[PDB]
Amino acid sequence: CPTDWKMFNGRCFLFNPLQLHWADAQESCMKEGANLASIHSLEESTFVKELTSADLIPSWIGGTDCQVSTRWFWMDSTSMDYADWCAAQPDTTLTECCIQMNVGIGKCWNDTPCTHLHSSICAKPLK
Ligand SMILES: [Ca+2]
Numbered sequence: 001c002p003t004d005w006k007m008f009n010g011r012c013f014l015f016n017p018l019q020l021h022w023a024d025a026q027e028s029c030m031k032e033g034a035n036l037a038s039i040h041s042l043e044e045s046t047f048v049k050e051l052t053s054a055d056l057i058p059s060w061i062g063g064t065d066c067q068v069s070t071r072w073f074w075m076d077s078t079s080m081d082y083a084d085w086c087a088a089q090p091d092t093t094l095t096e097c098c099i100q101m102n103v104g105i106g107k108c109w110n111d112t113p114c115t116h117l118h119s120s121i122c123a124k125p126l127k
Contacts, residue, residue, distance in 0.1 A: 008044065012126055013037060013121060016028060019117040019119065035074075036063075036123075039082060056107045057119050058103050058118055066097035070092050085109050086104055089108070098112060099111055
């Protein structure tokens, strides 16, 4: 993997501490040939959590159901075969359609307004 990135299951990951809304976070990843990260297993979830410091900082990941409620998509076009929703989540309301991880005391996923500023996780295949 390139310098500051970390490898896991054929992909490289990076924690971007900069506070950005979802769209800016995705744009920031694209500048590096990446996408906000998709997560497909508890093993991957744990690996990414280890990139967010001892505080497990709330972070944007690349999933949303912003087009049609309840229809979730990852920006890297991989399948939605895993989720780590907090209790009662997701709300599926189009007004809070971007996935945020490391949310609350449970450090789980919560769909939230995409305009909120958060750190983020970027990922891209290993070359
Ligand atoms: Ca929510």
